[PDB]
Amino acid sequence: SGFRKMAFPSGKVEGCMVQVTCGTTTLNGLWLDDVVYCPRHVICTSEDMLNPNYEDLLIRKSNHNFLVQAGNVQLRVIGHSMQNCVLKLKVDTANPKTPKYKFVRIQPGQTFSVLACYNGSPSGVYQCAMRPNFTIKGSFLNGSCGSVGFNIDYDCVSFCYMHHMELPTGVHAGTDLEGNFYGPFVDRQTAQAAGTDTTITVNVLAWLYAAVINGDRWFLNRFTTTLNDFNLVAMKYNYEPLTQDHVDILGPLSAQTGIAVLDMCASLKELLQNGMNGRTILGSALLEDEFTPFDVVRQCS
Amino acid sequence: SGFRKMAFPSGKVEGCMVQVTCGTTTLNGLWLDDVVYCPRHVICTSEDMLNPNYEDLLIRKSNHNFLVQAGNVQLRVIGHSMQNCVLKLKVDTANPKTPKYKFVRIQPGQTFSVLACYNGSPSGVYQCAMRPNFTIKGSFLNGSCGSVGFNIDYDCVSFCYMHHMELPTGVHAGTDLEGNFYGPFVDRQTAQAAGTDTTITVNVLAWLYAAVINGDRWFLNRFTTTLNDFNLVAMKYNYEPLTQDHVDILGPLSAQTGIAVLDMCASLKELLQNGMNGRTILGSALLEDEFTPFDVVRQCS
Ligand SMILES: *[C@](O)(C(N)=O)[C@H](CC1CCC1)NC(=O)[C@@H]1[C@@H]2[C@H](CN1C(=O)[C@@H](NC(=O)NC(C)(C)C)C(C)(C)C)C2(C)C
Ligand SMILES: *[C@](O)(C(N)=O)[C@H](CC1CCC1)NC(=O)[C@@H]1[C@@H]2[C@H](CN1C(=O)[C@@H](NC(=O)NC(C)(C)C)C(C)(C)C)C2(C)C
Structure with missing residues (x-):
């Protein structure tokens, strides 16, 4: 008895969080078997995000420009590619703590647990619901981009969210693990409105x-x-x-x-x-x- | 930006949760190095909890009356002892997932993360505050006794709470990891009142x-x-x-x-x-x- 907003245990997801650095920006990445998923605007400077051409910006980058760190353990990037708004970095080592997982795109009104991370280190866990206007009310500071949302099905982590951007009044937007934004948002620092909730x-x-x-x-x-x-x-x-x-x-x-x-x-x-x-x-x-x-x-x- | 009730990552504690059964009653236990801590009223029948003499009841109990399961592997209890209201079952195997830990007794007004578990399996995680009347407002069903509260200061885990009993209006009471109850409560199924909060x-x-x-x-x-x-x-x-x-x-x-x-x-x-x-x-x-x-x-x- 008693009713509380209760998130899933974060153990399986904690072992998949890594730190991804490209030039200026450091954020979080998701390390499944031999691929590291992270927001693609990690390659951007502060000036780039005003109007970025991610195709031309990514061409400027090579494998050695991506610093990936799992704790104190350096991962070597042997390949990079862009899927929608998510950067996929191929690494030389398969993540041994990779749980059974799926990539799901949740429907509005459904809930999921967010493992808020900073510099690749998990910081906290809480519940969020995908609003009908495809936003979430989370808690994300500078450096939490790349933190993921997930659900658990008996051992199966269903990843459904990756955090990208902040909207006015504590409102947050992101993508699924295939790089497709929830809602009408784009990863560009220009005026964007969320729908009537x-x-x-x-x-x-x-x-x-x-x-x-x-x-x-x-x-x-x-x-x-x-x-x-x-x-x-x-x-x-x-x-x-x-x-x-x-x-x-x-x-x-x-x-x-x-x-x-x-x-x-x-x-x-x-x-x-x-x-x-x-x-x-x-x-x-x-x-x-x-x-x-x-x-x-x-x-x- | 944004503010949410946020609990600590529960990964280090998930590897410490086991299942403890003694006849009719099944609850959760905390598996640190070679000791399993759990509420002492697990040895009680439903009639026993009305007015239990825990010294007499524990003498009637043997090692083989304690069924301890960590996943699908059953732990061999090689001893038992009672510290205040916590039963300490020494086991054959040292927990290989034992994190660096402390036992702390928190002050009223301080918060901690609760890993709600059932049958030794973690179910969810949420934040609770030790009320001034030494109760907490958590979410505990039948079988969640033995779930623990904790804080993370370092690589170090500070265990501070173990759940024992339910009070009216979703109110819960428990002990520290040394078996000392927070507040005036005793582990007996009889009329007890919490102080004015x-x-x-x-x-x-x-x-x-x-x-x-x-x-x-x-x-x-x-x-x-x-x-x-x-x-x-x-x-x-x-x-x-x-x-x-x-x-x-x-x-x-x-x-x-x-x-x-x-x-x-x-x-x-x-x-x-x-x-x-x-x-x-x-x-x-x-x-x-x-x-x-x-x-x-x-x-x-
Ligand atoms: C993450 O990348 C990170 N480093 O953690 C970052 C988190 C925010 C929270 C302060 C920095 N996300 C972004 O920086 C994201 C990258 C540039 C623009 N971003 C924003 O979050 C901006 N929000 C915004 O522009 N909102 C609209 C589109 C005007 C409604 C900030 C003004 C908050 C920086 C981009 C590509 C979205
Ligand atoms: C745990 O042991 C468990 N099995 O998970 C159990 C949780 C409750 C919630 C339904 C079972 N704890 C107890 O059963 C605890 C053991 C007997 C009495 N307990 C109670 O929780 C009782 N509460 C109670 O007596 N409250 C007062 C003292 C009247 C204010 C219940 C009525 C909820 C069973 C004891 C020793 C406290």
Whole structure:
């Protein structure tokens, strides 16, 4: 009992973090078997990032221009190539701590754990959710680019995020492990806008179910709603519309509590129209939308 | 930029978690060099925990009654002993993954990372703060007893907490690694009350400094207060009194922002009296007190 924002154990990912230096900039790289993945703007100077031609900039670089360090251990670069926005450096040594892994591109509304690193050294771990506008609310200082996001499936690290850039108001953007940015962003230091963000409705409901499981039930009412009636309220407050697929995903939570999903949507309907009146739910005075239904069942197991 | 509740990398601790079963009860153990530390109530039946005589119960127990599993390999218990509330099972094998470690007893208001484990397998990691009433607000299901809290100062791991029991409203209690309970709690299934909790004032101020560093500064006013005058408002709102030691601790944050500590106390004095007017600070509608000044400097370095 008790509900906390909880990240996956970072052990398997810690052994894959290395330090990549090219000229001025030092950042983090991901060392899978004999390839080191890192953001491609490691080759840029501060002037380059205003309007970089990564093709011509990378041609200026050769293998010996890339300094790769796993702790105090120098890796020798025997090849370099660019995949979208990620630099792939071939090294002479296969990473012996390489876990079973996949490269996944997560969907908006899903969560993952971030291993924040600096100069190739892991610093901390925390949970983040891919916002509907394809940004994340993380914690990244100068030197944390190349830090990765991941999920764990019984021994299989599903890498899904690599950090590249910072947006106003603690907003962060990055790519998958194939170099494709999440959202409309480009790795260039020029004016870019993130889309209008929306609240992940199915995540709020799962978080409301987590509160009921932990004995926090003051928000439950006697009313009920339909899917069209609730979605009418939902888009008024910039919530994502709820689908029957979302209702099926909340099945295990609805079954454990005995509360129908349409019943819970009626309580969320009142919470949006009347506010929380200074009350708290699971220790929060706001409606939380960064817990997936899977995140709830994993803690309420 | 950005501020998140961030736990330490759990890799060094993951290699120390084993499974300890004694008949009906299964929980987690901490495998340091050739000793497995775990809560002593593992030897108890459900009837035993109502009023256990741990000296008599441990005498009735043999080595072969302790099932210790590290992954799929079972460890040979070659001895047992009781230190306060922790059972120390000496094993055949020295843990080859033993990191450099200390046993520390933390002070109230300090934070640590919890590696939540189940059946000896790490499940998640999150941050917790030792409340002034010597409890923590974690996430522990049945089978998570023996999960440990820790801090990383170096290559060195500072173990500080081991989970034992659950209190109402998601409240948890445990011991240090020497078996001494934090607070007035005993490992017996009988009526026990936690003390009235207070808000960690120095932690709230550090969190307000983190908001200013991240550009969230609406709560700042031009007023100021005395350390004596501020503690009279803090006493009304169940806040811990602020000392000159706390003011000196907040030095680095005060210097980075250019805001004197007593100027920040004036802003907090008004937030307590006037409320927060339905606005957020670092994405929170409540005042957060689970970030130490060290936690803030670590993320705002
Ligand atoms: C990483 O590469 C690193 N060294 O850790 C770095 C992290 C930031 C956080 C301070 C430096 N990422 C970048 O520097 C990234 C490289 C240049 C521009 N970057 C930015 O983060 C800029 N943000 C930005 O331009 N935002 C928009 C596009 C205007 C909305 C900063 C102004 C924060 C430096 C590029 C190619 C994106
Ligand atoms: C761990 O041992 C475990 N198996 O993971 C277990 C965790 C709890 C959470 C459900 C099982 N800890 C205990 O069972 C602990 C052993 C008996 C009593 N315990 C409790 O946690 C009880 N709490 C409690 O009695 N609280 C007071 C004292 C009434 C305020 C439960 C009622 C939660 C089982 C003991 C020795 C404390």
